[PDB]
Structure 1
């Protein structure tokens, strides 16, 4: 499914992505846009044969099982195909666990490239939440 901007913001909050770990929902709305263009089917293959799944582009090298990455970890305990679904449940839990961890939100590249140090409020402007 290709979420609209707000339709997403609403679904993200409604799972517990609003101001989780002290990061307002304007950072996750933006993160999904630059990462996947709100499209929950998006995929990109990296030069090393792993692939990025879902609305936030979560790597099969560590986080999920696609079958076609030998020496993959699957730390989120799911098939990478769950990261493609219209139901963002299993792409939030995993987006959560990635952030609740090491670099934190700097573990979000797209976020860290474009939205870190920007008024991430523009991304919620107009949205019935």
Structure 2
């Protein structure tokens, strides 16, 4: 499913992401925009053989099991296909584990490179939340 900007914001808020670990809603929406273009079905394979899945592009080497990443840790205890669902619940629960991992949102390279230090509030402007 390809979410609309305000639709995703509303779903993320309802799921407890607004200000989770100090990160305002605009941060999460900006990250999803640049990680997957708001598409739950996005996948991207990496040079090391691992693959990133979903709206927030979580890596199969640490977060989920895709059955083809030797040495994968599966810290969110879910098959990677779960992250591609139209229901963002699994993606949200896993994201909460990741952001609490110590590096905060820097775990998402697109966030670090294109959201961090910008007017992230712009991402939720105009939305009825």
Q: Same fold (TM over 0.5)?
A: yes
The normalised TM-score by structure 1 is 0.98
Deviation at 1:110, TM superposition (A): 1.0
- Once residues 45 and 99 of structure 2 are traced to their aligned partners in structure 1, the CA distance between those partners, rounded to angstroms, is 22
**Secondary structure at 2:52 match in 1:** strand
Moved more, 61-70 or 100-109: 100-109
Deviation at 1:22, TM superposition (A): 1.0
Which residue is 2:59 aligned to? 59
Deviation at 1:66, TM superposition (A): 0.2
Deviation at 1:101, TM superposition (A): 1.4
Encode CA deviations 1:57-108: one digit per residue, 9 max, x unaligned: 0000000000011111101100000100000000011011000112112112
Which residue is 2:110 aligned to? 110
Q: Are positions 1:4 and 2:4 aligned together?
A: yes
Higher helix share: 2
Number of positions where the alignment pairs a residue of Structure 1 with one of Structure 2: 129
RMSD of the alignment, in Å? 0.6
Which residue is 1:94 aligned to? 94
Gaps of 5+ in 1: none
**Secondary structure at 1:26 match in 2:** helix
**Secondary structure at 1:105 match in 2:** helix
Gaps of 5+ in 2: none
The normalised TM-score by structure 2 is 0.98
